[PDB]
């Protein structure tokens, strides 16, 4: 009990980085992996990211002058909603990227 406490502090997931290869050949075949790798490179998840980036940047260019301000989220009738939608789309986009 005096040792195992720094586990989550500085753990880098080796399995998530695909370095447990010696234990991955039990249910792996070459053609399936190559087909997936060919049909992996972007081209499926960056499109909606750009779609949301478009609306985020167009609302931030002019309507984003006082959008995200918390005082605007305090003293206003629509800028609070502008802050809410700006933070919502920011979280959506960075979650999609990750």
């Amino acid at each position: 009990k005096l040792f195992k406490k720094n586990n989550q502090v500085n753990r880098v997931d080796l399995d998530f980085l695909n370095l447990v290869f010696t234990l991955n050949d039990k249910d792996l075949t070459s053609y399936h992996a190559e087909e997936i790798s060919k049909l992996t490179c972007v081209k499926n998840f960056v499109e909606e990211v750009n779609k949301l980036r478009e609306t985020n940047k167009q609302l931030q260019e002019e309507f984003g002058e006082a959008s995200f301000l918390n005082f605007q989220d305090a003293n206003q009738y629509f800028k609070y909603s502008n802050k809410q939608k700006l933070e919502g789309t920011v979280d959506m986009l960075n979650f999609l990227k990750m």
Binding site: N7, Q8, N10, R11, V12, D13, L14, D15, F16, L17, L19, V20, F21, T22, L23, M98
Partner: protein
């Protein structure tokens, strides 16, 4: 509560940019030529520009070879790897000594890796429930699971594998988890303090309530050599059967 053994009186070569040494500095006195050569060699080392350099020094006992070695090891800092081991340790038993020398060369070379990871964490509420669409009995693939944390609660459903991870952790409604979304499994912080005190005694730790917003995100930087990766890959890490 201190122990000094023929060392800890040395902290560096004590040089400058112009290769000028100091007569009494860093626990080293004298040896102008040796200090100049060591400074030049460590300056070449710091550039990471080469590999396989070698040098032999002729020094009698107590002349200061080990002191120079320790000083040069401290020149590059704790993070730069080093493994000065006795020459009689080569003659091992369970592995041929040339293989050991290759293993030491593998250990010596360093690297710095990193990874960014997210994680969610007590449980506010719980609502469990897809169709078989055929001859299958049923299809359970989504369950809303609460996530209390401290700074805000954000319940969310994911792949069912996270649900079976919840049963694997055997966490109650008033139990805190630490679920790194990279794998969908569970890391257990422990029980919670809110739904606690159900009894006067508990061997299981009550565990402090998690601090911060539930959708935790962080990045980790670790300097790990390659031989650790080799030995980790050599042996299995999981399994459930005999």
């Amino acid at each position: 509560v201190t122990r000094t053994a023929a060392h800890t009186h040395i902290k560096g070569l004590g040089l400058d940019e112009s290769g000028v040494a100091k007569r009494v500095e860093g626990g080293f006195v004298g040896q102008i030529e040796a200090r100049e050569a060591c400074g030049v060699i460590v300056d070449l080392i710091k550039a990471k520009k080469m590999s396989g350099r070698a040098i032999l020094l002729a020094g009698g006992p107590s002349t200061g070879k080990t002191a120079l070695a320790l000083a040069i090891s401290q020149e590059l800092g704790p993070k730069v790897p080093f493994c000065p081991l006795v020459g009689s340790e080569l003659y091992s038993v369970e592995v041929k000594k040339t293989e050991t020398l290759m293993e030491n060369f593998r250990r010596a070379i360093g690297l710095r890796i990193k990874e960014t990871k997210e994680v969610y964490e007590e449980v506010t509420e719980l609502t469990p429930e897809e169709n078989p669409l055929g001859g299958y009995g049923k299809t359970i693939s989504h369950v809303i699971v609460g996530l209390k944390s401290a700074k805000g609660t954000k319940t969310l459903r994911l792949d069912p594998t996270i649900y079976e991870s919840i049963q694997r952790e055997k966490v109650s409604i008033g139990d805190v988890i630490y679920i790194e979304a990279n794998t969908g499994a569970v890391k257990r912080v422990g029980r919670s303090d809110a739904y606690a005190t159900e009894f006067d005694l508990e061997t299981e730790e009550y565990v402090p309530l998690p601090k911060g917003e539930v959708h935790k995100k962080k990045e980790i930087v670790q300097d790990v050599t390659l031989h650790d990766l080799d030995v980790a890959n050599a042996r299995p890490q999981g399994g459930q059967d005999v």
